[PDB]
Amino acid sequence: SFIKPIYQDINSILIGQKVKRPKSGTLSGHAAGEPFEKLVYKFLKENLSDLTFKQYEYLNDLFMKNPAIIGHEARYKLFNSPTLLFLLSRGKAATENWSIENLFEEKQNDTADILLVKDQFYELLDVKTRNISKSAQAPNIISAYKLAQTCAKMIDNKEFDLFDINYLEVDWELNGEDLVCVSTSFAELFKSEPSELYINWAAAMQIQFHVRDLDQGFNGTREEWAKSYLKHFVTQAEQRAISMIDKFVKPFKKYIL
Amino acid sequence: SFIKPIYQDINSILIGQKVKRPKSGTLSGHAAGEPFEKLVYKFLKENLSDLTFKQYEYLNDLFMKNPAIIGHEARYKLFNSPTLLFLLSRGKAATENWSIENLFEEKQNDTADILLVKDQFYELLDVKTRNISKSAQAPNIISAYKLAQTCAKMIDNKEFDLFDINYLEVDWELNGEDLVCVSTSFAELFKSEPSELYINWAAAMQIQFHVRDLDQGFNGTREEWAKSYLKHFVTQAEQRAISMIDKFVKPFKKYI
DNA sequence: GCCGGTC
DNA sequence: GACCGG
DNA sequence: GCCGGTC
DNA sequence: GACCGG
């Protein structure tokens, strides 16, 4: 983590800062603590000025920096890695269509919130904003499927030392008119026990967990994580297939005439 | 529908309205352009003051005009419909601890955006906003599971004419700084083919479709719709069960 | 006191 | 809540 | 058209 | 994206 060494420097500048309320609307989804994210980001951009990127912002550089490369075919070679490509790419049309006059913008599917790159190594930083003024279910963290596929690309292409998935939790509450932050937590994904990882099928098959509570007790290799998690995925997958007939079939097969 | 009769008047008032972009940043997800839903409530509230309600506003009004009744126990009995209950009611401890000094507020998963009750008949209206500047996928309309459980209750209790589930799609486009409505569409769920509905199992098991695309040529009866939806549901389920294995298992086993 | 459904 | 297609 | 993952 | 319990 390029952010870990300065986690403190970040935790401080955040806790206690007062931002305006989210358009005075539903503090839900992509509107909860938006401001904080831009906050954490601007911070890094000032501190880690040369390592800090925003997924798309990053892509636009990768391409702009290689002006002579046109056509999705060659541009996809600008990644120099299947796995990494899988996680940051934009699709045939979008890629082929790219241009200095048709720059990439923010997309809802974008994997990471912030990209920190240095020495052929990438840190995919994703922030989770929690309305601490209550106690809710575990937030969608990332796709179990996109995770499973990512692992497979890892094993195959054998890129066990390329990227890192880290989560920065930003707890905020509504103190008066502003949206103040009260706490912050950090955690590495591949530093967690994959067999523990909870996969909520309905919840967009996303694995869910509060950064704060995320277990960081894993002492194996990244190649071992990929392999173990992938096994975890398969079992739970089958398992859900079973629970799906019980819950969504049996009790209704009685109304089916 | 109580809206239907005046939809054309609504379409006129909604089309042309503008709303300032949230933080001017990324306008997508939950809060993408949903602030339009308010404009619907606002308008609906002025033209239909006595029917227009907010799910919570309706619940609070229900409890407010029954002071003699307290405790979740008796409170849930005020609905007089196991179905409406399941669809509208709030949580037990939430119902228990209710009072003017502590009213119901906006919950993220309330079944409806607007309630227009009238004469024991309920029309649970939902507003759906779309960024017309693109060809996005159909949005989540409502859980297939919740819909299923609702279809099962209509049966068991014979409530085949108590409520309705309609949808109002409101299309917009960015006009520089604020978003501006450019169209609208109204569709009833129970008037569509209970079997052609597409169940997106990954997306909260939601039923997805662009309101403008949904049909309205169901000539059968509510009881039939229900019986047919369940059949459709119970089948898709089995499918997803199979498919899930071929897409999330088969291709990965070569790694354990 | 884990578990997971819904906008 | 509502998003396009490496 | 049809299908369906993912913030 | 992020929400609790009819």
Name all domains of chain A by residue range, CATH numbers in brackets: 1-257 (3.40.600.10)
**Strand D contacts (CB < 7 A) among B residues 21-80?**
28-30, 32-34, 37
SS3 category, B243: helix
- DSSP letter string, B119-134: TTBEEEEEEEEEETTS
Please name which of A44, A21, A12 lies closest in space to residue A179, comparing C-alpha atoms. A21
One-letter amino acid of B39: L
Query: Searching chain A, which residue's CA lies closest to the CA of residue B254?
Result: A152
Residue A8 to residue A14: CA distance in whole angstroms:
10
Token pair recorded at residue A234: 């398969």
Phi, psi of B207 (to 5 degrees): -90, 125
Residue B252 to residue B256: CA distance in whole angstroms:
8
Phi-psi bin for B203: left (phi > 0), alpha (psi -120 to 50), beta?
Answer: beta
A235-249 exposure pattern, b = at least 16 Cβ within 10 A, e = fewer: ebbeebbeebbeebb
Long-range contacts of A103-106 (CB under 8 A, 24+ apart): A103/A60, A104/A56, A104/A59, A104/A60, A104/A63, A105/A56, A106/A54, A106/A55, A106/A56, A106/B25, A106/B26, A106/B28
Measured in angstroms, the resolution is 3.0
The answer to whether B148 and B206 have CB atoms below 8 angstroms apart is no
Token pair recorded at residue B145: 């599971």
User: What are the residues facing B171 on neighbouring strands?
Assistant: B130, B183
A73 vs A57, A78, A156, CA distance in Å?
21, 9, 21
Please name which of B39, B49, B177 lies closest in space to residue B117, comparing C-alpha atoms. B49
A146 touches B: beta carbon within 8 Å: no
What DSSP character marks residue B5? G
Burial classification of residue B3, based on how many CB atoms lie within 10 Å of its CB (0-12 exposed, 13-18 middle, 19 or more buried): buried
Strand bridging mode B114-116 / B122-131: antiparallel
The answer to whether B130 and B139 have CB atoms below 8 angstroms apart is yes
Let me know the angle formed at the C-alpha of A31 by A199 and A181, rounded to the nearest 5 degrees. Answer: 90
Distance from CA of B254 to the nearest CA of A (A): 10
Token pair recorded at residue A107: 């997309």
Neighbours of B42 (CB within 10 A): 13
Residue B243 to residue B208: CA distance in whole angstroms:
19
Residue B217 to residue A29: CA distance in whole angstroms:
35
A106 touches B: beta carbon within 8 Å: yes
Of A22, A28, A108, the CB nearest to B22: A22
B242 touches A: beta carbon within 8 Å: yes
Residue B165 to residue B185: CA distance in whole angstroms:
15
Please name which of B249, B253, B230 lies closest in space to residue B241, comparing C-alpha atoms. B249
Please name which of B199, B196, B234 lies closest in space to residue B218, comparing C-alpha atoms. B196
**Strand D contacts (CB < 7 A) among B residues 145-184?**
none
The answer to whether B117 and B111 have CB atoms below 8 angstroms apart is no
Distance A172 CA to D6 C1' (A): 36
Burial classification of residue A78, based on how many CB atoms lie within 10 Å of its CB (0-12 exposed, 13-18 middle, 19 or more buried): middle
Phi, psi of A28 (to 5 degrees): -115, 165
Number of CB pairs < 8 Å for A and B?
122
User: What are the residues facing A118 on neighbouring strands?
Assistant: A121
B30 and A34 in contact by Cβ < 8 A? Answer: no
A29 and B30 in contact by Cβ < 8 A? Answer: yes
The answer to whether B181 and B243 have CB atoms below 8 angstroms apart is no
Phi, psi of B42 (to 5 degrees): -50, -55
- CB < 8 Å to B202, chain A: 201, 204-205
- CB < 8 Å to B25, chain A: 34, 38, 106
The answer to whether A106 and B26 have CB atoms below 8 angstroms apart is yes
Token pair recorded at residue B31: 């809060």
- DSSP letter string, B63-112: HHT-TT--HHHHHHTTS--HHHHHHH---HHHHHT-BTTB-----TT-S-
Element (H, E) at B37: helix B36-47
What DSSP character marks residue B50? T
B22 vs A31, A114, A229, A235, B165, CA distance in Å?
8, 21, 38, 42, 29
Token pair recorded at residue A60: 């636009």
Residue with tokens 């119901």: B104
What DSSP character marks residue B136? P
Residue B131 to residue A220: CA distance in whole angstroms:
46
The answer to whether B191 and B216 have CB atoms below 8 angstroms apart is yes
Residue A200 to residue A207: CA distance in whole angstroms:
6
Residue B183 to residue B173: CA distance in whole angstroms:
10
The answer to whether A218 and A227 have CB atoms below 8 angstroms apart is no
Query: B84 CB contacts (<8 Å, ≥6 apart)?
Result: B122, B159, B162, B163
B134 vs A78, B170, B177, CA distance in Å?
28, 14, 18
- CB < 8 Å to B34, chain A: 25-26
Of B202, B230, B245, the CB nearest to A205: B202
SS3 category, B165: strand
The answer to whether B3 and B41 have CB atoms below 8 angstroms apart is no
Residue A116 to residue A164: CA distance in whole angstroms:
10
Residue A89 to residue A84: CA distance in whole angstroms:
8
Residue A166 to residue A240: CA distance in whole angstroms:
27
Token pair recorded at residue A173: 């509450």
Residue B32 to residue A31: CA distance in whole angstroms:
8
Query: How was this structure obtained?
Result: X-ray
A5-38 exposure pattern, b = at least 16 Cβ within 10 A, e = fewer: eeeeebbebbeeeebeebbebbbbebbbbbbbbe
Token pair recorded at residue B5: 């009769």
User: Does the CB of A200 fall within 7 Å of any strand C atom?
Assistant: yes
Residue A158 to residue A165: CA distance in whole angstroms:
17
Best to test chain B binding among A131, A146, A252 (most B CBs inside 10 Å):
A252
Please name which of A147, A97, A125 lies closest in space to residue A10, comparing C-alpha atoms. A125
- DSSP letter string, chain A: --SGGGHHHHHHHHTT-EE--STTS---GGGSSHHHHHHHHHHHHHHSTTTEE-HHHHHHHHHHT-TT--SHHHHTTSS--HHHHHHH---HHHHHH-BTTB-----TT-S-SEEEEETTEEEEEEEEEEE-SS--PPPEEEEHHHHHHHHHHHHHHT-SSSEEEEEEEEEEE--TTSEEEEEEEEEEGGGS-TTT--EESTBTTEEE--GGG------S-HHHHHHHHHHHHHHHHHHHHHHHHHHHTGGGTTT--
SS3 category, B1: coil
Token pair recorded at residue B65: 């005009």
Query: Searching chain A, which residue's CA lies closest to the CA of residue B156?
Result: A255
Residue B218 to residue B57: CA distance in whole angstroms:
32
SS3 category, B59: helix
B23 touches A: beta carbon within 8 Å: yes
Phi-psi bin for A115: left (phi > 0), alpha (psi -120 to 50), beta?
Answer: beta
